Amino acid sequence: MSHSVKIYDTCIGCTQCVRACPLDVLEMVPWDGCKAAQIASSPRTEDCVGCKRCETACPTDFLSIRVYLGAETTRSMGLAY
């Protein structure tokens, strides 16, 4: 199920999305496309709820991290019951 979280090559490696994410969906991995030498990654999208905090945080001209809401699970619906 889960949502989809894509990271595009306009990433500047500021990591603000990872710090904003309240469910630990994102990581920083080494890259060579930007000065910061790091790119955001979404290795745990099965826990992603889709609150869009990462997108709120992204500074690049139109987001370099994009959350497309998809199939809804109890983890993705933020359910505690």
Binding site: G50, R53, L69, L79
Partner: protein, 751 residues
Amino acid sequence: MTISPPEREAKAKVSVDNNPVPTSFEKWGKPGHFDRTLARGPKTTTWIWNLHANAHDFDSQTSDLEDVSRKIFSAHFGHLAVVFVWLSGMYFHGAKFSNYEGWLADPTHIKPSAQVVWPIVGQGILNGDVGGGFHGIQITSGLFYLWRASGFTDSYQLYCTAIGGLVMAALMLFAGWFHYHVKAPKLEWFQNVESMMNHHLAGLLGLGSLGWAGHQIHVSMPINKLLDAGVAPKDIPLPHEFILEPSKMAELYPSFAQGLTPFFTLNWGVYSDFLTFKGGLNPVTGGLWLSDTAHHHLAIAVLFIIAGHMYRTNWGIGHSMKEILEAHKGPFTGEGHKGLYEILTTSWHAQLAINLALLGSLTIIVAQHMYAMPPYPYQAIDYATQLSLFTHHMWIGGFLIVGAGAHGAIFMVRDYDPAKNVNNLLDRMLRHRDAIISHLNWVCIFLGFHSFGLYIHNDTMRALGRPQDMFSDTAIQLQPIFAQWVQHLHTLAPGATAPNALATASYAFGGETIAVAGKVAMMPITLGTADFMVHHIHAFTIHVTALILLKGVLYARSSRLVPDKANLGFRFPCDGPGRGGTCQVSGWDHVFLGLFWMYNSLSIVIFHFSWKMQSDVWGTVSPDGSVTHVTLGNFAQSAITINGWLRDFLWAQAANVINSYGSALSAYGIMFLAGHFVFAFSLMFLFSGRGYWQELIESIVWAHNKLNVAPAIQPRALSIIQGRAVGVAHYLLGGIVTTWAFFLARSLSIG
């Protein structure tokens, strides 16, 4: 270094800073200075709206609790200045633009009027003939009645009151300036809650009613006794002539012959000439007895002055509020009130929530008390004045209550410390808020089904031609048995459980039908199945408003959906479309929904009041005594169905507002249409969303770019929270203005 007085510490708990904030006009020319985010510069039009949204948010402006307290103190001064200007304008318009003396000479055959419209573009039709050749707008504030009760006779006295009100406003304004800029009290000064409370109970409330009892005994009561006997206002001596001639006071009240000796020697009984306890209403004017009110204010002065001693300040005797709080803790509540004294002395929003709740409740109490115990002369004759004051105090109370919920939520977000609240009342309520809110939800559903559901059942039964299956006094009766029993107990109180009371506290509980002039002042108000149903509707709507607002407060920190909501703030749109969508989780949004539901509740309350008073109370009495009510006692059979409320209440009584054109009440029909318009207008903001409007602004901005007229402050659609604020503000304004026009036109047209 402005004007520096000596000291004035009086060896007290006073502690001020001599001159913390200097006076200057430069920050006037820099709009947005109080917020760091706005002092930079407006790049989008959002900056503009924010400039108004955070003006009084002193917490987000500075972190010094002392500076916030000083700001609040000086703003209180400025607010009292505004209210003094308003009241002085009221007295000035009564002095130089009202028919108060002509009304005083013949109150029955004239209508209270102030404010003369200037004859232009045809608006001169609004100067309707109120009596004695006077043409103007009829006022429903009831200022003339308060003035006759006070003992006013000449316009020059009202003009002196207006001049004094302007001077008092200047005093409050200067005091605010002086106490924020020059001598600014330290934080330690505001935290003397025992001192403040002793003073407010003793000096503010007690001495106030003491001085007003003095004025009523010396000025109000004798002038009103001479007016009720018909001595005419031109022949009654000035108020001071009773102080200069104690024989004139003894001739009206022989008790004044014995002097102050009955007071000092506890011989109070001889004071029966002006300190009375009759209970009912004045036969000549329909208001309360001014001697009863003087004795009342006297006893209230006594009680409040005495109460102003419980708390401890500098002299050892008294009470420590922290001690009384910490003492109260039981087996169900862990540590009870341990920590409440600390939050009620360092958090402004806590005091504000408590005070807003109690003040709104008190204003509702004031409406419900002033309608049935009319305290002013000739008030009950004027059904417009009565209805207007009732609905006004209702709305004020409801708004204050919604604000109370708001600031409870704000406290929870901003000033809540879990270390200072461990296993106390607040902690345990947060620990079982799920239980609380789920049960309140169930009670709300039970009330909706068992109040409005009764109306739906009755509509369906009557439509099917099955009146015997309806809920009504003539079928399946739902008698308000307990309220009827309490009414009966009230009726039997004088002479029995109230020996020294001559009459009942309020004739709405039962008894004779007190009637002044051709109209009925007050008579018993029977209660039946329709009253049962309306009262349980009231219960339902009040419980739903409480559910919304209490849920807003209890979950402002967190929920199972949003566990870190406290970090998001009191006021924020959402936390994303994720988790299924999290729109309106903030405390602010709960206030936003509670606004609509309080509007719903109070609309029903005032509709109930208007219809019940027009059906079973107000009317014309005959020389034989026959009572023909305004709408012929139609409440019992019509107010039990929704179609009855739509036809016999709304549709029927709307006939005056719609036919008001070409007459003095035409502005009421105009404002009727205007309120409908603004209500409809609000639905655009409430039903839509910011994204569409911003995208449309994109094309409009492109058209501006095409002709090079694009503004540097980029147009941005209203923020989500602002969209809702605009929506709710216009919804409330439109609906309330509609019913304001409806009520005023209907009540002024029925004579």
